[PDB]
Amino acid sequence: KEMPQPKTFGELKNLPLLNTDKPVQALMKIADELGEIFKFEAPGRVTRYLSSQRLIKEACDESRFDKNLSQALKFVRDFAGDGLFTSWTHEKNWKKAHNILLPSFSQQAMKGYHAMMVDIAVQLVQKWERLNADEHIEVPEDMTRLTLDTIGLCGFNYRFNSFYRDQPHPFITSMVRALDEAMNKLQRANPDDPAYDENKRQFQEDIKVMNDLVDKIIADRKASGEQSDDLLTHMLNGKDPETGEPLDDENIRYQIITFLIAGHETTSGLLSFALYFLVKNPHVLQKAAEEAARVLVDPVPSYKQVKQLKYVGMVLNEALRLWPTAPAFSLYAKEDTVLGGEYPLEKGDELMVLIPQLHRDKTIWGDDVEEFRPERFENPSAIPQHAFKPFGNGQRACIGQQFALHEATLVLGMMLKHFDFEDHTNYELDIKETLTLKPEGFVVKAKSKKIPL
Ligand code: HEM
């Protein structure tokens, strides 16, 4: 069977389709037109975009397919190195870091981070409490302040103090620009053309800024000797049970850079989309706010009370269904194989999983896929295998899933406890794409319910 393919541009093939500031959303539109699979070609490379649970469940078979570094991730690898996110499965440092860090990211480990997560969450609530009447909130911006601060504090005992600033930390200016430069190199023609001398000079300056600041944080912790229980202490002391080896300082830096990218980009988006959907669906907002008031009976929320917020968890999973903030991941065929009993693949052939389209698969979810209904995630066992993949697949799934969800559930619980929300502008959804998705310009007013902290 001949594989569907979108419109070509002569010798440039399909590559000019990505020359747009919303490539994922364009690929989603192409998927609606062409269906469950389509071919995508650029000069000297090819991949296949998958959109149905039927094909993606086979793609998620770890005996047949393994994580591939997409072109974007290969560019991100120039500053994320061989950290967990940008390393190949067969690289020694992946399995080492994975075995070392798994216990630090578990559900039990969240009991340890909870205190510091509340520290930052209280700073968000107090900011909003202290706004004057008729002032508004810039939601993505404020969620990013929170999520960046939380990973900095919980991870490496470093306070970015984003709620004390308008202009971001020097690390973040370099990190955001490096990610932008990684994204812009996908849409580019010729690399060594000296017209991009300033692009390369900035990118190398941004690498050095991230490396120097993070390497200083490693050396300062080593020289201190103090044992503040966090990601950095676990990495300096911990040993891989398999090889018996620790991570060296170069890899540790890459893991820290990786966690800062993660805790900045994806996690704030989840909270942003979640609040968007809540203000656009007042009955769902009502249910979640009712739970928050009933469950969060103390001024300082405990770990147990965050686990008790079941409906707030359902709200977040439905936000992850409609707009998964890390919307695509790449795979490659380990051997020759046949996908879906009709698409023969050779060893090394690549696949892209388009997660927003998987999450709109009508044969799994029904015909109302665009509606925001948290009741879909009432029973987690009711969701078929590989139907809901906002945190990726298998051994290369998101190590920060429990961190992200605990943080988002705590913060969204507290937000719903302490405020009523107004969509005062009648905000029209406008999704800006970088590494991740964000509702750009999403604003609300938060009127206080006047419950003390
Ligand atoms: C809403 C929040 C988040 C989402 C939607 C998300 C999504 C994902 C996805 C889809 C992957 C798989 C990438 C691939 O297959 O190429 C992944 C990997 C990863 N994420 Fe996240 N993530 C989130 C938050 C976090 C946080 C907070 C951290 C760390 C503090 C984190 C750390 C990682 C790491 C290290 C990997 C690489 C795992 C490995 O291959 O060993 N993520 N994430």
Side-chain angles (χ1 to χ4, degrees):
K1 196 181 180 184
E2 286 78 49
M3 193 176 290
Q5 187 178 171
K7 65 194 183 178
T8 55
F9 291 72
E11 77 290 338
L12 300 178
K13 303 279 182 60
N14 293 307
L15 185 60
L17 298 172
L18 300 172
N19 191 11
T20 177
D21 55 58
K22 297 176 190 192
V24 175
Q25 290 164 86
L27 289 159
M28 285 169 69
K29 189 185 172 174
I30 291 166
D32 283 322
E33 292 164 6
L34 302 179
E36 68 180 353
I37 180 164
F38 63 87
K39 197 186 216 76
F40 196 98
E41 291 176 321
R45 59 198 312 98
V46 64
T47 189
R48 299 142 199 80
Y49 281 89
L50 306 181
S51 287
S52 68
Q53 189 272 349
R54 188 184 79 81
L55 298 181
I56 293 162
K57 71 176 184 183
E58 289 186 34
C60 292
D61 187 347
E62 294 180 288
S63 68
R64 300 168 61 189
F65 304 89
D66 180 34
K67 166 156 165 160
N68 179 228
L69 302 183
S70 66
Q71 188 59 248
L73 289 189
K74 282 183 188 157
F75 293 134
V76 173
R77 195 182 155 90
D78 296 323
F79 53 96
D82 64 344
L84 290 170
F85 184 51
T86 50
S87 61
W88 302 91
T89 304
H90 53 76
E91 284 182 293
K92 181 174 166 183
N93 276 324
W94 174 76
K95 185 61 169 175
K96 269 180 72 168
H98 175 76
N99 293 336
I100 288 161
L101 292 157
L102 249 179
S104 301
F105 279 108
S106 66
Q107 189 55 52
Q108 290 303 122
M110 298 310 109
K111 293 180 189 179
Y113 306 127
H114 182 81
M116 294 173 293
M117 291 193 180
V118 175
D119 185 300
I120 307 308
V122 169
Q123 288 187 48
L124 178 77
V125 174
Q126 290 201 314
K127 176 171 173 172
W128 291 4
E129 292 275 29
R130 289 164 175 169
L131 294 180
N132 303 292
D134 291 27
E135 288 185 353
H136 70 266
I137 291 155
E138 300 182 306
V139 170
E141 290 82 356
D142 270 345
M143 295 306 92
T144 297
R145 287 192 173 78
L146 174 130
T147 60
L148 172 59
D149 279 31
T150 303
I151 188 55
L153 185 53
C154 296
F156 341 106
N157 200 49
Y158 188 83
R159 286 175 181 277
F160 287 108
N161 290 306
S162 302
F163 293 111
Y164 297 86
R165 300 168 184 251
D166 288 319
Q167 268 287 117
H169 200 274
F171 181 93
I172 303 293
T173 53
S174 298
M175 193 198 75
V176 169
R177 192 159 53 205
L179 290 164
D180 178 46
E181 184 56 32
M183 193 200 75
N184 292 149
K185 268 185 271 187
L186 303 177
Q187 308 160 231
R188 202 155 287 180
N190 275 223
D192 295 29
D193 182 32
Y196 302 120
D197 275 0
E198 225 299 305
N199 287 250
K200 291 175 168 56
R201 197 231 75 195
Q202 268 283 13
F203 191 63
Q204 293 298 135
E205 192 183 59
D206 292 334
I207 290 157
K208 186 181 158 63
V209 166
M210 288 185 282
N211 293 357
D212 290 8
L213 277 36
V214 173
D215 287 344
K216 178 164 162 55
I217 289 158
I218 312 311
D220 285 2
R221 180 64 68 77
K222 273 191 154 186
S224 292
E226 69 98 68
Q227 204 88 141
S228 59
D229 201 342
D230 60 15
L231 270 33
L232 180 52
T233 297
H234 292 139
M235 286 188 292
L236 291 171
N237 293 345
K239 295 184 181 191
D240 171 28
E242 192 175 290
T243 62
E245 301 184 357
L247 304 181
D248 63 1
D249 291 356
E250 192 178 303
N251 188 251
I252 290 167
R253 176 229 290 172
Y254 290 133
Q255 303 301 347
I256 291 174
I257 292 165
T258 302
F259 302 145
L260 290 164
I261 291 158
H264 179 99
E265 295 274 293
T266 51
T267 317
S268 58
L270 171 53
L271 283 158
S272 300
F273 281 117
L275 185 57
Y276 165 85
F277 283 123
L278 288 162
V279 302
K280 297 290 181 186
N281 298 83
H283 297 310
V284 175
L285 175 52
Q286 193 274 344
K287 287 180 177 64
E290 188 280 313
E291 187 180 69
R294 177 162 46 75
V295 172
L296 304 176
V297 302
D298 299 321
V300 181
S302 66
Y303 171 86
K304 267 160 53 56
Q305 292 165 345
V306 172
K307 298 304 102 181
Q308 188 172 193
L309 296 169
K310 195 212 184 184
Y311 195 83
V312 174
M314 291 159 61
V315 164
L316 294 165
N317 281 331
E318 183 73 345
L320 290 165
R321 190 183 67 76
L322 281 162
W323 293 113
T325 51
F329 60 95
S330 192
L331 304 165
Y332 74 92
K334 291 163 67 67
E335 302 297 344
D336 291 358
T337 192
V338 189
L339 188 65
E342 57 178 301
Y343 299 110
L345 302 171
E346 304 181 54
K347 178 177 183 183
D349 285 355
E350 294 174 35
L351 303 171
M352 295 294 300
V353 178
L354 208 60
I355 306 166
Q357 291 300 300
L358 170 63
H359 291 171
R360 294 161 171 76
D361 192 332
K362 295 181 178 182
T363 62
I364 300 296
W365 299 101
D367 289 14
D368 65 349
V369 295
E370 295 296 324
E371 290 172 27
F372 190 83
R373 306 198 304 99
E375 294 77 24
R376 293 184 214 273
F377 296 89
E378 161 58 51
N379 200 322
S381 299
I383 302 149
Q385 197 180 216
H386 311 307
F388 184 61
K389 309 202 77 59
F391 294 103
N393 182 57
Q395 72 185 329
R396 307 306 307 269
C398 186
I399 200 170
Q401 175 175 342
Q402 285 77 36
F403 194 93
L405 292 179
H406 191 79
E407 187 183 1
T409 309
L410 172 61
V411 170
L412 188 53
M414 289 181 77
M415 286 163 54
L416 295 165
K417 174 182 174 173
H418 290 282
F419 307 101
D420 291 309
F421 293 98
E422 196 195 333
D423 182 22
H424 71 285
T425 70
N426 192 13
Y427 171 73
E428 199 201 323
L429 189 58
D430 181 14
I431 296 162
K432 185 185 170 59
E433 305 197 10
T434 55
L435 203 223
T436 60
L437 309 173
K438 298 288 166 69
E440 184 176 33
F442 173 47
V443 294
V444 292
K445 290 184 182 168
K447 212 213 174 195
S448 180
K449 299 165 89 83
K450 281 285 195 291
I451 298 159
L453 289 156

